[PDB]
Amino acid sequence: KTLEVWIMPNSPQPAEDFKALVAPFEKAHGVEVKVTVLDWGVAWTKITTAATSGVGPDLTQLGTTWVGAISAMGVLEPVDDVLEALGGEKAYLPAVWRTTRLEGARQATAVPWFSELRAFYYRTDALKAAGVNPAEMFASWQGFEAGLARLKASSFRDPETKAPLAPLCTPGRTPRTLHNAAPWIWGAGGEIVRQAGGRWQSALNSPESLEGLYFFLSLAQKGYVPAESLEKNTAQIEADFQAGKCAVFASGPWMIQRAQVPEAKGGFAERTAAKNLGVAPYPAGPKGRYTFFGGSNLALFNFSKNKPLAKELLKYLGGPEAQVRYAQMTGMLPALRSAWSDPSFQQNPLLRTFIQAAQFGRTYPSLAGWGGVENLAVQHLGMAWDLVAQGRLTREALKDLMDKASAAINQALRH
Numbered sequence: 001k002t003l004e005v006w007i008m009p010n011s012p013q014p015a016e017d018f019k020a021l022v023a024p025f026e027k028a029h030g031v032e033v034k035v036t037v038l039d040w041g042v043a044w045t046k047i048t049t050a051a052t053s054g055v056g057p058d059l060t061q062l063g064t065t066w067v068g069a070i071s072a073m074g075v076l077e078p079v080d081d082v083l084e085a086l087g088g089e090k091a092y093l094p095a096v097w098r099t100t101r102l103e104g105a106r107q108a109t110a111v112p113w114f115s116e117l118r119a120f121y122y123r124t125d126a127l128k129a130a131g132v133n134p135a136e137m138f139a140s141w142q143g144f145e146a147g148l149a150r151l152k153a154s155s156f157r158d159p160e161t162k163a164p165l166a167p168l169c170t171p172g173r174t175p176r177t178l179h180n181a182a183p184w185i186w187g188a189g190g191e192i193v194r195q196a197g198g199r200w201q202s203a204l205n206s207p208e209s210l211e212g213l214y215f216f217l218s219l220a221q222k223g224y225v226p227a228e229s230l231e232k233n234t235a236q237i238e239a240d241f242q243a244g245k246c247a248v249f250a251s252g253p254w255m256i257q258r259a260q261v262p263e264a265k266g267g268f269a270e271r272t273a274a275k276n277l278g279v280a281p282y283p284a285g286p287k288g289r290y291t292f293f294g295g296s297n298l299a300l301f302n303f304s305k306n307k308p309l310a311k312e313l314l315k316y317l318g319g320p321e322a323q324v325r326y327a328q329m330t331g332m333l334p335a336l337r338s339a340w341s342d343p344s345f346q347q348n349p350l351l352r353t354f355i356q357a358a359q360f361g362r363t364y365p366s367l368a369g370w371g372g373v374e375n376l377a378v379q380h381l382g383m384a385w386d387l388v389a390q391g392r393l394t395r396e397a398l399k400d401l402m403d404k405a406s407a408a409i410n411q412a413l414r415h
């Protein structure tokens with residue numbers, strides 16, 4: 001007997017790590033778990049095709065932001081039973097619990113697997129040579145921009161590249177998500193969507209959201225981000241940070257784990273950046289401090305022929321032992337709140353900064369139409385980045401683009 005599991009590349013050897021994670025389960029149940037690894041870029045298509053076609057695995061990893069969308073298609077097995085065996089609502093951060101179902105659904109359709117949230121990695125050697133105190137740079141928007149200005153005027157050169165660093169790297173080219181943009185929207189007092197007595201609408205074109213978006217996009221128009229970096233997706237920006245090409249960038253806690261892994265095994269431990277690595281939270285904006293809080297859950301397709309055995313695997317993957325071990329293998333945080341207390345997370349100095357930054361963590365609402373909203377937002381945000389690359393992003397042009405994005409988003413939400 002066999003379970004099929006789909007997962008995304010959460011660890012450097014995603015298939016091998018997952019297999020090693022489920023080995024005790026395989027031994028004890030006398031079952032094989034076959035895993036297929038999907039790139040995040042193809043995962044949405046593969047999972048929605050399994051949903052519509054009725055062909056796919058027993059279990060899939062689902063980004064937290066996708067749970068609502070796939071759940072609304074009516075294809076997921078209820079897992080209230082698994083969540084009750086794992087300790088129920090009390091055992092989860094309420095922000096994590098809200099990702100176990102479509103907003104306002106009767107039944108849970110996803111088991112929390114891991115959490116991740118966003119902060120700034122920074123080069124400790126570069127900030128020092130620029131005369132930047134990270135406690136000032138990462139306090140406030142004004143401290144953030146003043147730090148980038150000292151980084152731009154720095155005479156520091158990476159000891160391996162023999163070249164200057166860019167103050168900030170952020171991806172322009174593949175905006176697959178709003179995750180990079182959301183903290184800036186939120187810190188201005190904005191939102192991506194807003195509910196008015198029931199109905200959801202875009203707030204991307206609200207004065208507050210436009211203020212946050214303009215603040216962030218204009219850092220790049222001011223010369224703090226190289227034009228190069230707007231050519232690049234997330235994976236290429238990570239590589240540029242690892243190769244010593246920039247002083248600061250936003251990512252999740254997986255980069256700490258990759259930094260202690262040799263290059264031979266998919267890490268960057270021998271690079272200067274890994275040996276001079278700091279983490280600081282997103283700076284507070286004029287209306288508050290927020291960061292993107294997400295992660296992945298696991299779900300069971302209602303066409304599975306092995307629902308009992310698959311629920312046993314969900315309970316195992318959701319539980320204390322597998323929660324600590326998978327978070328170690330990935331550099332993610334446990335989804336299970338109790339597991340955060342494991343000394344191996346609490347005593348990691350860079351990871352403790354992610355753990356404290358979770359006080360300000362913020363999630364998207366769990367909407368049926370979420371896939372559509374994110375897809376439409378990034379399409380329009382992509383065009384704003386195109387204006388940045390040409391030095392032509394004005395507040396008027398940004399507003400014009402988010403007015404169009406909001407019409408597209410509202411039309412999709414009315415369905």
Ligand SMILES: OC[C@H]1O[C@@H](O[C@H]2[C@H](O)[C@@H](O)[C@@H](O)O[C@@H]2CO)[C@H](O)[C@@H](O)[C@@H]1O
Nearest residue numbers: 040063064065066116177234294295296
């Ligand atoms: O939007 C899909 C989910 O994204 C998750 O973050 C991913 C990101 O998409 C990848 O590009 C790569 O960087 O890995 C990240 C961590 O898995 C996010 O955690 C989820 O909440 C989203 O649903």
Ligand SMILES: [Cl-]
Nearest residue numbers: 191192193364
């Ligand atoms: Cl929002």
